[PDB]
Amino acid sequence: QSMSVGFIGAGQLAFALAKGFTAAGVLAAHKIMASSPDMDLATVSALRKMGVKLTPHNKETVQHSDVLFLAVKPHIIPFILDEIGADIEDRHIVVSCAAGVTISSIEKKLSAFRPAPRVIRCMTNTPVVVREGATVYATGTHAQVEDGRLMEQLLSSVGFCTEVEEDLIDAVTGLSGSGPAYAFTALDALADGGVKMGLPRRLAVRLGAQALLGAAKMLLHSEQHPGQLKDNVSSPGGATIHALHVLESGGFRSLLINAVEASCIRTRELQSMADQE
Amino acid sequence: QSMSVGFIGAGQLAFALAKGFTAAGVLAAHKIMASSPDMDLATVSALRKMGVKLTPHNKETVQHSDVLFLAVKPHIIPFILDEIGADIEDRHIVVSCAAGVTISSIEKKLSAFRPAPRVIRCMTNTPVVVREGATVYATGTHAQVEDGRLMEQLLSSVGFCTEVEEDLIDAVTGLSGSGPAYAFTALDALADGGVKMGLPRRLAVRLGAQALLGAAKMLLHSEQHPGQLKDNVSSPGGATIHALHVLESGGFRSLLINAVEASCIRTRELQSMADQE
Amino acid sequence: YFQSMSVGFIGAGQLAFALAKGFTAAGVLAAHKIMASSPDMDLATVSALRKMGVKLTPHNKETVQHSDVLFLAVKPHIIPFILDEIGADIEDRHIVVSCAAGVTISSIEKKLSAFRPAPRVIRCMTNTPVVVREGATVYATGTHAQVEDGRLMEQLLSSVGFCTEVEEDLIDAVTGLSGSGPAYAFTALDALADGGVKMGLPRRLAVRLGAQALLGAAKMLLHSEQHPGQLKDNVSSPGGATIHALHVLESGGFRSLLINAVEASCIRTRELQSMADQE
Amino acid sequence: FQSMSVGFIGAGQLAFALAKGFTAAGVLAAHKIMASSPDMDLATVSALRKMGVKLTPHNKETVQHSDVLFLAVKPHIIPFILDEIGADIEDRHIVVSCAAGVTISSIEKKLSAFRPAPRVIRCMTNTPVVVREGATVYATGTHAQVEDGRLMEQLLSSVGFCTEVEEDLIDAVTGLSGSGPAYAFTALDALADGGVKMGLPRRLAVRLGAQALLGAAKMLLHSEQHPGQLKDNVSSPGGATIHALHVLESGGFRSLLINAVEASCIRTRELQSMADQE
Ligand SMILES: NC(=O)C1=CN([C@@H]2O[C@H](COP(=O)(O)OP(=O)(O)OC[C@H]3O[C@@H](n4cnc5c(N)ncnc54)[C@H](O)[C@@H]3O)[C@@H](O)[C@H]2O)C=CC1
Ligand SMILES: NC(=O)C1=CN([C@@H]2O[C@H](COP(=O)(O)OP(=O)(O)OC[C@H]3O[C@@H](n4cnc5c(N)ncnc54)[C@H](O)[C@@H]3O)[C@@H](O)[C@H]2O)C=CC1
Ligand SMILES: NC(=O)C1=CN([C@@H]2O[C@H](COP(=O)(O)OP(=O)(O)OC[C@H]3O[C@@H](n4cnc5c(N)ncnc54)[C@H](O)[C@@H]3O)[C@@H](O)[C@H]2O)C=CC1
Ligand SMILES: NC(=O)C1=CN([C@@H]2O[C@H](COP(=O)(O)OP(=O)(O)OC[C@H]3O[C@@H](n4cnc5c(N)ncnc54)[C@H](O)[C@@H]3O)[C@@H](O)[C@H]2O)C=CC1
Ligand SMILES: O=C(O)[C@@H]1CCCCN1
Ligand SMILES: O=C(O)[C@@H]1CCCCN1
Ligand SMILES: O=C(O)[C@@H]1CCCCN1
Ligand SMILES: O=C(O)[C@@H]1CCCCN1
């Protein structure tokens, strides 16, 4: 309750998490501060109306915060760590949200200034903004047991959250981190299919999104295999099995596997370049 | 509250709706009766444990019911209507859930026995079982205004529900009716992609489903275009835009359009055969 | 009982051989209580039937007079000529079992009813694995088949594999799945063997391992209540070799090709029978 | 062999499958079997419990209980396991590695640091051992005695086909019969969807497709004829089956199965190459 939260970066992810946290009630907007070198951002304007404290100065965010989220682009992380490293205290829990960036790389930058930085790495996604996020976290070398439990409590307020080994996170990034983009592409296309068959666009968007929401919820609430739930939809000779055939004829399943793989491979490739630098 | 509901048919759709209605609290299990010529069905066993009254005799379902759902396969509908047509009373609201079957065809069969049958046609989907269904309905020639409002009240308890013109329903069937099957295929494949990149299968299923649920919820709660929400996920040069490219290279969008179209075309084709018979 | 039943095959080809070998291997019938007829004795199937001890004759009337249960095992377009030829020889005691793809009970009963009013007709679809008593058989009973006729036919065909009664309107689809099925399987086993050879296995070992793998997986599914996707999930470890191989199957639309096959077989069956009904 | 104690290090899919097959075969009483795992909250551990298999978290307990010791852990866990119990391997032990890709030489090098001449056998099997129709190959290590191989072949023949091979074939066998059940399950799911599309109930389509594949596989195993000849026997000229074969050929059906065996084998070799660099 006395917990103060800070965001280095004031972009899409910082907005989504601050919106989710405040809607969840687990944090008052006034306990949150975010910093950015650009206050002319739509997300900065939104955070202001929410009641989040804003500043150009990353040092002010550090000084206000107990839990410090790093919500900048991955290549900005080392610059950020050099800038505020001398201002980290024993009270701080540093939570990196950046795609690809390793706990090792973060702990090495911070340890030059003060031993035993408490670091947690997470991967989440934009649906935390409607409290339906998918989040994983890995705890660092000096994180205490209460640090992981605190972070799971906080991130569970805005969706699914579980601890993982760090070597799983790049793959999670390709699945649930990039996942919403696959869904939005799919929903746009399903709506176009509805329009082609005679539905108004607004209705098609609503129906397609509601269908995907409900099916996903069924699977999360069921112990059955997704193929069994699929079997339950189709009648023999019917419309649904005819539609499933044309998906299969296009290699639909393989394209989704291709996407998760391509995201994960790019994440690893980018971090290799960072480590080489 | 005094309303009694009956299901002709005791299969996947009847279970899903009865489960959703009772979980919603809008109906007590004991106000529901369902009939089937086969009590050795898993769905019949499930309905029994819920507290739903079961019978082999469709006439008993009619006699108990105020609202009567037709939840049999489309080709069974005319047989069903011939069987119980003499038992429909002025109190009855007949709600056909059957894919493709027209209000005209139903009103013609029932009108031979008694004038002015009150008929509503709906299309829904299995996620009503977790109260996240997508339902549309069209009112028949003799349905009263309170009949449509009653049905929207009832079906809104288990998900989205809106009135449509009947000529939209076959297209809705290809989008949200068959939709859950597209989602389950997609979730199975996304999980395989997670497994390929090193995630345990149970975790990949959970993450993929949670990602699709959250993205769908974002779109339902946003006024923004799905392409804008997609743009918000990707950073320049990043993992997500790399993954979106490989989806595009496979014609991912076109496959989903193909599916909605194929389902809708099959539905129309099947009903043409029924009308020819 | 069963060994006292006389069985006849009109047609002495691949299906008659497969069934006669299955029945005799099962011990339900003595080979010499089977008679088969063909206008062509220079077939390999006739020679094999002869070596088993089946009675062979060129005269379909002899097969009819010999038999109690009479299997029609000729090509579908031959059935109406067969029915014209021996229809007058069908007796009240006969059970007539059509194995021909596509041919309807109605077409058979219309021919035979011109001779006697209540011909007992059963239609079945089976497959060549009856030869190792692992066939997949369905049957539908005709207008005049007694309840005991269906029970007898199920007992007989269960001796050489799986057997269940179905409505007749399912049989063309069954034909595209389990009737044509063994050919899809032999194609797949030939290709899996080539895959083993490409990766360095001797052909003989690759053939045996591929066939054992498919047999064991199919038996697993038949003995499990789990979805095939779940059994599939259990084979793969994260990042491992099996999931990499499943991806390249998916990239080629592997699933859609098998759906295409069942559909193509069933559509061709319906199309041929429509030409027969037109003729 | 009633004087034989079998142990599993690992209590996952493969250990369950083998234990269920051995016990169903009657060659082992379930109480003569011990399995270890650091995680007792697995579905496979509960199933092993109900069978009457002894469970323990301690790999050393499994080693002390067992004469034949199956390594049923993921390949990257093998070197850790060997470090943990290498000092407990006795002369009596036969160590049977089931792990994909892991070489006899790598196992022998680990165990030899503790006691010379470890008796090592490498095998590749598959999950259908659970219905006693597995396909297993094995290779004997440097110090395996002649009777060690014969004993293993007797034990593994009780749950399916089993033959000795040169070790350099095992990665390819892994891509064919090791991964093979997954190809079949994919095919059976798809064939069932095909049956449903043409009007069959799903339960019936699943049963018929599985029976068709089982019977055709048995036909081939029992026949001296080429699979092409058995295929030819199914088709009549102009008929339904040859029409269906054509659409398989037009999609390169054969090439996809070759692709799968190749992709599995290449990945196995790639993974072990990384293990050997580490
Ligand atoms: N957008 C998404 O869907 C998700 C993004 N992420 C991660 O979140 C991090 C940020 O992602 P987005 O918010 O999408 O980026 P974004 O580009 O919307 O916001 C980036 C923010 O960093 C600020 N910034 C740049 N230099 C700075 C500095 N020196 N000090 C402080 N702030 C600075 C920018 O002004 C902007 O406010 C990335 O590492 C990304 O991998 C992870 C999960 C999902
Ligand atoms: N499964 C789905 O996803 C949805 C299905 N529907 C529609 O719901 C209707 C039923 O669909 P499912 O429940 O999936 O079918 P289902 O096959 O699971 O259940 C069909 C039920 O009808 C019963 N039945 C057969 N003959 C009968 C008779 N003479 N009298 C009474 N009951 C009889 C069967 O025994 C079975 O209980 C279909 O028209 C379908 O289009 C619509 C929305 C979604
Ligand atoms: N081969 C298979 O895998 C299966 C075939 N079937 C059905 O079995 C029937 C026969 O198929 P196959 O045995 O494969 O054909 P096949 O061509 O091997 O043998 C056909 C037999 O009919 C004989 N025949 C031709 N004219 C005749 C006549 N007037 N009187 C008597 N016999 C005559 C031929 O000489 C030959 O012995 C077909 O209707 C086919 O659909 C059904 C299930 C599987
Ligand atoms: N599943 C299959 O279809 C086949 C698997 N294999 C091989 O069998 C081995 C196991 O495969 P699955 O059983 O499928 O894996 P699985 O993941 O189902 O079970 C793995 C087991 O290892 C246990 N484990 C992890 N660390 C351990 C440790 N330090 N000490 C003891 N147990 C530990 C886990 O708790 C789990 O019980 C792999 O090397 C695989 O290549 C070979 C043939 C077929
Ligand atoms: O495949 C079918 O016959 C049905 C039609 C309606 C929505 C669900 N699936
Ligand atoms: O495209 C990107 O850079 C990020 C990576 C992490 C998840 C969201 N998208
Ligand atoms: O996918 C895997 O890791 C294993 C390899 C061995 C055979 C079965 N599947
Ligand atoms: O190709 C054919 O004509 C037959 C039809 C029946 C099943 C087996 N093959």
Whether the CA torsion A68, A71, A74, A79 is positive or negative: it is: negative
Residue B59 beta carbon below 6 angstroms from any ligand 2 atom: no
The kind and range of the H/E element at D230 are helix D227-234
Residues of C in contact with A231 (CB under 8 A): 227
D37 carries a ligand binding annotation: yes
Asked if the C-beta of D172 comes within 8 angstroms of chain C's C-beta atoms, the answer is yes
Distance B14 CA to ligand 2 centre (A): 7
Asked if the C-beta of A250 comes within 8 angstroms of chain C's C-beta atoms, the answer is yes
Q: Which amino acid is at D195?
A: G
Shortest Cα distance, chain B CAs vs residue C244, angstroms: 6
* Residue appearing with tokens 């009109």: C10
Between chains, do B196 and C233 touch, taking CB under 8 Å as contact?
A: no
Among D43, D51, D50, D57, CA closest to D19: D51
State chain B's maximal CA–CA distance in angstroms: 69
DSSP 8-state assignment for residue D256:
H
Between chains, do D189 and A227 touch, taking CB under 8 Å as contact?
A: yes
CB contacts < 8 A (B, C): 25
Q: How does strand D33-36 pair with strand D54-56? A: parallel
Q: What residues contact residue D255 under an 8 Å CB cut-off, 6+ apart?
A: C191, C252
Q: How far apart are CA D211 and CA C255, in angstroms?
A: 18
3-state secondary structure at position C124: strand
> For residue B184, what are the CA distances in angstroms to A216, A227, B210, C10, D66?
8, 7, 13, 49, 44
- Calculate ∠ Cα D210-D211-D215, nearest 5°: 120
Query: Are the beta carbons of A180 and B215 closer than 8 angstroms?
Result: yes
Measured in residues, chain A has a length of: 277
Q: How far apart are CA C27 and CA A254, in angstroms?
A: 49
Identify the bridge partners of residue B162 per DSSP, sorted by sequence position: B136
The residue contributing the CA closest to ligand 1 atom 19 is A11
- Calculate ∠ Cα C74-C75-C78, nearest 5°: 80
End-to-end CA distance of chain D: 40
The kind and range of the H/E element at B159 are strand B159-163
Distance B232 CA to ligand 1 centre (A): 11
Q: How far apart are CA A176 and CA D8, in angstroms?
A: 35
Q: How far apart are CA B3 and CA D230, in angstroms?
A: 63
Between chains, do D202 and A227 touch, taking CB under 8 Å as contact?
A: no
Residue A1 CB coordination number (10 Å): 6
Q: Which ligand is nearest to the CA of D202?
A: 2
Distance D40 CA to ligand 4 centre (A): 14
Q: How far apart are CA D25 and CA D19, in angstroms?
A: 10
Q: How far apart are CA A227 and CA D186, in angstroms?
A: 11
Q: Which amino acid is at A189?
A: A
Burial class (CB in 10 A: 0-12, 13-18, 19+), C230: middle
Nearest CA in chain A to D201: A236
Q: How far apart are CA C119 and CA A236, in angstroms?
A: 32
Distance C235 CA to ligand 4 centre (A): 10
Nearest to A227 among C229, C259, C260 (CB): C229
Query: Are the beta carbons of C124 and C138 closer than 8 angstroms?
Result: yes
Q: How does strand B133-139 pair with strand B93-96? A: unpaired
Task: Supply D29's token pair.
Answer: 């009483």
- Calculate ∠ Cα C198-C236-C258, nearest 5°: 65
Counting DSSP H helices and E strands in chain B, the numbers are 12, 8
Q: How far apart are CA A216 and CA A180, in angstroms?
A: 13
Query: Are the beta carbons of D194 and A237 closer than 8 angstroms?
Result: no
Shortest Cα distance, chain B CAs vs residue C23, angstroms: 34
Q: What residues contact residue D150 under an 8 Å CB cut-off, 6+ apart?
A: none
Edge-to-edge strands of the sheet including C69-72? C55-57, C34-37, C7-10, C69-72, C95-98, C120-125, C135-141, C161-165
**CA B250 centroid distance within chain:** 30
Task: Supply A112's token pair.
Answer: 């030059």
Distance A73 CA to ligand 1 centre (A): 5
Task: Supply D265's token pair.
Answer: 């084998």
The kind and range of the H/E element at B95 are strand B93-96
Q: Torsion angle, CA of D134/D137/D142/D144, rounded to 10 degrees? A: 40
Edge-to-edge strands of the sheet including B133-139? B53-55, B32-35, B5-8, B67-70, B93-96, B118-123, B133-139, B159-163
Among D216, D227, D244, D204, CA closest to C18: D216
Q: How far apart are CA A73 and CA A47, in angstroms?
A: 19
Q: How far apart are CA C10 and CA D148, in angstroms?
A: 56
Residue A235 beta carbon below 6 angstroms from any ligand 5 atom: yes
Residue C214 beta carbon below 6 angstroms from any ligand 3 atom: no
Residues of D in contact with C221 (CB under 8 A): 185, 188, 206, 210
Q: Which amino acid is at A236?
A: P
Residue C213 beta carbon below 6 angstroms from any ligand 7 atom: no
Q: What residues contact residue A174 under an 8 Å CB cut-off, 6+ apart?
A: A259, A260, A261, A262, A263, A264, A265, A267, B193, B194, B197, B239, B243
The kind and range of the H/E element at A7 are strand A5-8
> For residue D118, what are the CA distances in angstroms to A137, B193, B194, C162?
42, 40, 38, 49
- For residue B139, report the phi and psi dihedrals to the nearest 5 degrees: -90, 145
Residue A263 beta carbon below 6 angstroms from any ligand 1 atom: no
Q: Which ligand is nearest to the CA of D81?
A: 4
Pocket test for ligand 1, best of A72, A102, A172 (most atoms within 8 A of CB): A72
Binning chain A into helix, strand and coil, the percentages to the nearest 5 are 60, 15, 25
Task: Supply D192's token pair.
Answer: 């069932």
Q: How far apart are CA B211 and CA B204, in angstroms?
A: 10
Between chains, do D244 and C216 touch, taking CB under 8 Å as contact?
A: no
Query: Are the beta carbons of A35 and A9 closer than 8 angstroms?
Result: yes
Query: Are the beta carbons of D197 and C259 closer than 8 angstroms?
Result: yes
- Residue numbers after which chain C breaks, C to N beyond 2.5 angstroms: none
Between chains, do A197 and B170 touch, taking CB under 8 Å as contact?
A: yes
- Calculate ∠ Cα C241-C247-C249, nearest 5°: 110
Task: Supply D164's token pair.
Answer: 């000795």
D192 carries a ligand binding annotation: no
Annotate A181-228 with DSSP letters as a single string: HHHHHHHHHHHHHHHHTT--HHHHHHHHHHHHHHHHHHHHH--S-HHH
Asked if the C-beta of C200 comes within 8 angstroms of chain A's C-beta atoms, the answer is no
Q: How far apart are CA A185 and CA C192, in angstroms?
A: 37
C74 carries a ligand binding annotation: yes
Q: Which amino acid is at B195?
A: V
Residues of A in contact with B168 (CB under 8 A): 198-199, 203
Query: Are the beta carbons of C18 and C44 closer than 8 angstroms?
Result: no
Q: Which of A244, A256, A266, A270 to mutate to test the interface with B (most CBs of B within 10 A)?
A: A256
B239 carries a ligand binding annotation: yes
Buried b (16+ CB within 10 A) or exposed e, A69-101: bbbbbbbbbbebbeebbebbeeebbbbbbbbbb
**CA C236 centroid distance within chain:** 34
Among D212, D151, D149, CA closest to D184: D212
Q: How far apart are CA A162 and CA D253, in angstroms?
A: 41
Among C33, C66, C37, C70, CA closest to C52: C33
Among A268, A164, A191, CA closest to B206: A164
Query: Are the beta carbons of C28 and C159 closer than 8 angstroms?
Result: yes
Identify the bridge partners of residue A272 per DSSP, sorted by sequence position: none
Chains in touch with C (3+ beta-carbon pairs under 8 Å) read A, B, D
C76 carries a ligand binding annotation: yes
- For residue B159, report the phi and psi dihedrals to the nearest 5 degrees: 155, -160
Among A21, A169, A126, CA closest to B214: A126
Task: Supply A259's token pair.
Answer: 């996407």
Annotate D40-90 with DSSP letters as a single string: --SHHHHHHHHHT-EEES-HHHHHHH-SEEEE-S-GGGHHHHHHHHGGG--
The kind and range of the H/E element at C65 are helix C60-66
Q: How far apart are CA C203 and CA C183, in angstroms?
A: 20
Whether the CA torsion B79, B80, B85, B90 is positive or negative: it is: negative
Q: How far apart are CA B97 and CA B34, in angstroms?
A: 14
- For residue C65, report the phi and psi dihedrals to the nearest 5 degrees: -65, -30
Chains in touch with B (3+ beta-carbon pairs under 8 Å) read A, C
3-state secondary structure at position A53: strand
**CA C87 centroid distance within chain:** 24
Query: Are the beta carbons of C13 and C27 closer than 8 angstroms?
Result: no
Q: How far apart are CA C171 and CA C151, in angstroms?
A: 18
- For residue C91, report the phi and psi dihedrals to the nearest 5 degrees: -105, 170
Q: How far apart are CA C141 and CA C120, in angstroms?
A: 8
**CA B94 centroid distance within chain:** 16
Buried b (16+ CB within 10 A) or exposed e, A214-251: bbbbbbbeeebbbbbbbbbbbbbbbbbbbbbbbbbbbb
Whether the CA torsion B149, B151, B152, B153 is positive or negative: it is: positive
Task: Supply A74's token pair.
Answer: 């991955």
C16, HSE (Cβ side, Cα atoms, 13 Å)? 32
Q: How far apart are CA C150 and CA C229, in angstroms?
A: 35
Q: How does strand B159-163 pair with strand B133-139? A: parallel
Q: What residues contact residue D124 under an 8 Å CB cut-off, 6+ apart?
A: D98, D100, D136, D137, D138, D170, D173, D174, D177, D178
Burial class (CB in 10 A: 0-12, 13-18, 19+), C6: middle
Task: Supply B1's token pair.
Answer: 């509250």
Residues of D in contact with C180 (CB under 8 A): 234, 240-241, 244
